[PDB]
Design a protein around this ligand. Structure first.
Ligand SMILES: CC[C@@H](C(N)=O)N1CCCC1=O
Length: 475
């Protein structure tokens, strides 16, 4: 009873303090800084989904090994999501984001120089473990600086960088890989592509070193003075940028809540116990129903999205093969599909707070479900490309709404743990969807459509039952 009341008081005072600081230069600087990490996540997603099948160049491996390589990095990302999301609730958002990005950058760098399939597989697995933390940490980290007024719109604009990362990866695949001359004694061009894909995470580390830790984490962990200094930094930056530097931060006091390797082991066991306690508390009676409905929504949406997104270019390739019998194309098709997301991002960001998260999610899910039925009439490659663009454009709004809803439905001391668990479930659903949808390619275009449509309808029916979070302080 007591702790919940104190945390509600803290939430209200934190809302009041963030209204004191206002929204401005600081939040947009942080927006770009974390956008770099979302871009790194998008680059990793593209590489794993479309290139890691050794599409043209590596080719030193059997087809079964191509499938394994194209999939187990998703297991790495699942493990990373759970690990870093759990740890960020105990060690801090900035700390865990820095360590996760350092791991990703280091092992991506290593994967460029390895000489064998197995070591490359291992390096990409660890890079996926590293990058898995970006989404759950980034979204909570940014949300903890936002007032309720336009929180949904501000979070929705964040997803632009994931699309930018996908576009970057596709364009770099187009530019670098075909240029086999960009090699030296053997340092083939795929090494250059792998190396250049690591730049966004290095820039993310560099930029992130400049930003402060989340003050909400400090207040939730008893460190009043550090949170006060960080909040005064936010206020002073925003007022200086707005031409009112003479304004003084009025906040006085903020409510707050409260051998070497053997010591390391003790610390590790304590941290594991705390993370497991948070995860289990996510299933307590006060969050049980929300947690299960979110699990279902996330799983069904991820299954449909990833299965269909990988199925599309394979179907286009099969159509082209059948036409001929009567790589670049995959990269260009993925590039167009990633570009098609931009209008949906713009519209959903502008309308998130106006129409609400629940209606956005349900309407976008229904639109995706009905646009799945159009694929029965995909009579040509042009039609299939157009329908891929349509599906992505309508579906991305569901993801934006789900991100905002996941941020707002959980408390600050569980936010990254719950988000990491749900994102690991998302990556598991991605693995399952890719594996199942790959089997149907060329055999039928009924099974994948029915699977995706049913999953989306189930997701919509589950989404319609979640509570509305507008007009409420960030619990
Ligand atoms: C950060 C973007 C991310 C998300 N919403 O979590 N997206 C976009 C569609 C596929 C996906 O996972």
């Amino acid at each position: 009873a007591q702790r919940r009341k104190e945390r509600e008081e803290l939430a209200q005072q934190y809302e009041a303090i963030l209204r004191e600081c206002g929204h401005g230069r600081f939040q947009w600087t942080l927006y770009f800084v974390l956008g770099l990490a979302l871009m790194a996540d998008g680059v990793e997603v593209f590489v794993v989904g479309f290139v890691l099948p050794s599409a043209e160049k590596d080719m030193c491996l059997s087809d079964s090994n191509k499938g394994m390589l194209g999939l187990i990095v998703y297991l790495g990302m699942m493990v990373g999501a759970f690990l870093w999301g759990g740890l960020a609730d105990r060690l801090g958002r900035r700390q865990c984001l820095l360590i996760s990005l350092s791991v990703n950058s280091v092992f991506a760098f290593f994967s460029s120089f390895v000489q064998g399939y197995g070591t490359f597989l291992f390096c990409r697995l660890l890079s996926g473990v590293g990058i898995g933390g970006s989404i759950p940490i980034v979204f909570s980290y940014f949300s903890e600086f936002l007032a309720q007024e336009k929180r949904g719109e501000h979070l929705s604009w964040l997803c632009m960088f994931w699309m930018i990362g996908g576009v970057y990866a596709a364009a770099m695949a187009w530019a670098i890989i075909p240029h086999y001359g960009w090699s030296f004694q053997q340092f083939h061009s795929w090494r250059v592509f792998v190396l250049v894909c690591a730049f966004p995470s290095v820039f993310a580390i560099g930029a992130l070193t400049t930003q402060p830790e989340s003050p909400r984490f400090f207040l939730e962990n008893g460190k009043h003075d550090e949170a006060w200094m960080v909040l005064k930094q936010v206020h002073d930056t925003n007022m200086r940028a707005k031409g009112h530097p003479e304004r003084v931060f009025s906040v006085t006091h903020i409510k707050t809540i409260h051998t070497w390797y053997q010591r390391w082991g003790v610390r590790a066991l304590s941290l594991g116990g705390q993370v497991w306690g948070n995860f289990l508390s996510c299933f307590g009676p006060e969050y049980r129903r929300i947690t299960l409905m979110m699990m279902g929504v996330w799983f069904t949406m991820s299954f449909s999205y990833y299965g269909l997104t990988v199925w599309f270019p394979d179907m286009i390739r099969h159509l082209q093969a059948v036409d001929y019998a009567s790589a670049y194309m995959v990269y260009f098709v993925s590039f167009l599909g990633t570009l098609a997301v931009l209008p949906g991002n713009i519209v959903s960001a502008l309308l998130m707070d106006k129409i609400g998260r629940l209606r956005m999610l349900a309407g976008s899910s229904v639109m995706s479900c009905v646009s799945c039925f159009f694929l029965s009439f995909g009579n040509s490659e042009s039609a299939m490309i157009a329908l891929l663009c349509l599906f992505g454009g309508v579906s991305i709004a569901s993801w934006n709404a789900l991100d905002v809803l996941t941020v707002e439905l959980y408390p600050s001391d569980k936010r990254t743990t719950a988000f990491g668990f749900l994102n690991a479930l998302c990556k598991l659903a991605a693995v399952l969807g890719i594996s199942i949808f790959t089997s149907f390619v060329g055999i039928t275009k009924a099974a994948p459509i029915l699977f995706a449509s049913a999953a989306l309808a189930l997701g919509s029916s589950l989404a319609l039952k979640l509570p509305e979070t507008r007009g409420q302080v960030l619990q």
